[PDB]
Design a protein around this motif. Structure first.
Motif, PDB file in Angstrom:
ATOM      1  N   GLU A  18       1.119 -23.497  13.106  1.00 33.59           N
ATOM      2  CA  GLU A  18       2.116 -22.730  12.488  1.00 33.59           C
ATOM      3  C   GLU A  18       1.524 -22.319  10.818  1.00 33.59           C
ATOM      4  OE1 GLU A  18       4.776 -21.535  14.156  1.00 33.59           O
ATOM      5  OE2 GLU A  18       5.130 -22.946  15.475  1.00 33.59           O
ATOM      6  N   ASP A  20       1.932 -20.192   7.400  1.00 35.04           N
ATOM      7  CA  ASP A  20       2.479 -19.247   6.465  1.00 35.04           C
ATOM      8  C   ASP A  20       1.441 -18.610   5.321  1.00 35.04           C
ATOM      9  OD1 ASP A  20       4.911 -19.041   7.442  1.00 35.04           O
ATOM     10  OD2 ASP A  20       5.598 -20.539   6.096  1.00 35.04           O
ATOM     11  N   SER A  29       3.053 -14.392   8.722  1.00 32.36           N
ATOM     12  CA  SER A  29       3.078 -15.670   9.341  1.00 32.36           C
ATOM     13  C   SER A  29       2.562 -15.550  10.664  1.00 32.36           C
ATOM     14  CB  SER A  29       4.767 -16.154   9.518  1.00 32.36           C
ATOM     15  OG  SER A  29       5.256 -16.232   8.473  1.00 32.36           O
ATOM     16  N   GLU A 122      -0.435 -23.714   5.312  1.00 35.38           N
ATOM     17  CA  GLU A 122      -0.207 -23.125   4.065  1.00 35.38           C
ATOM     18  C   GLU A 122      -1.495 -22.166   3.619  1.00 35.38           C
ATOM     19  OE1 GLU A 122       2.597 -24.746   1.170  1.00 35.38           O
ATOM     20  OE2 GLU A 122       4.084 -24.822   2.848  1.00 35.38           O
TER      21      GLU A 122
END
Length: 231
Positions: A18, A20, A29, A122
């Protein structure tokens, strides 16, 4: 004996990725899924840009997208930091300097959530040229083989990693991406702090012919080396 961390990787493990991202204010994303087989050093992953079009080239995200799946030879088991930090996990901090362009800074938490190995990232990119090789999408959809160089950082109970990626540009030239990283355990227990060694990577990028979303299919093999008279 087989350590706790090693034991978590003896079979095929599902992976969830995942990310971002924000590169020069272009926000995006990505989610990815697949599996890892550490015995073979093998990753099979598919990534989707869930916000629409990816604003950077897919190849520039390959290094960001679970080094716990590296194949460590039996003779190098004492140098496998990444599995030793599991299941609690580790945090990877990287800076990636694109020569004559911007940089990415990434923070990734790598840990188990149940049976799934999660890579939660991130990414922040600044100082890119809006018409350069990255934001201008001038990089070929392919990937070279590289070595990744690992050393202990005892003071920080972790490791330091450095390497250079060469991305092929559509004109036949190359876009260098200089990587520097630190990996630190999340938990408070003992980890394996390695002697100097490297990981050897090979990567293949492809597309799913039935997928209409912007995406990348990655096949990657990763093997530890550099520490070796029985014969």
């Amino acid at each position: 004996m087989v350590s706790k961390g090693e034991e978590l990787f003896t079979g095929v493990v599902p992976i969830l990725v995942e990310l971002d991202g924000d590169v020069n204010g272009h926000k995006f994303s990505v989610s990815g899924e697949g599996e890892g087989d550490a015995t073979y050093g093998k990753l099979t992953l598919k990534f989707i840009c869930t916000t629409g079009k990816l604003p950077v080239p897919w190849p520039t995200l390959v290094t960001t997208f679970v080094q716990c799946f590296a194949r460590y030879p039996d003779h190098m088991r004492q140098h496998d930091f990444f599995k030793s930090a599991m299941p609690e996990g580790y945090v990877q901090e990287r800076t990636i300097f694109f020569k004559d362009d911007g940089n990415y800074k990434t923070r990734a938490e790598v840990k188990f959530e149940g049976d799934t190995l999660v890579n939660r990232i991130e990414l922040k990119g600044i100082d890119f040229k809006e018409d350069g090789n990255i934001l201008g999408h001038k990089l070929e959809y392919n990937y070279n083989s590289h070595n990744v160089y690992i050393m202990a950082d005892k003071q920080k109970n972790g490791i330091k990693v450095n390497f250079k990626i060469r991305h092929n540009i559509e004109d036949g030239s190359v876009q260098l991406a200089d990587h520097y990283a630190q990996n630190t355990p999340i938990g408070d227990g003992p980890v394996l702090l390695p002697d100097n060694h490297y990981l050897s990577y090979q990567s293949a990028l492809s597309k799913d012919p039935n997928e209409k979303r912007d995406h990348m299919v990655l096949l990657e093999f990763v093997t530890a080396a550099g520490i070796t008279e029985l014969y």
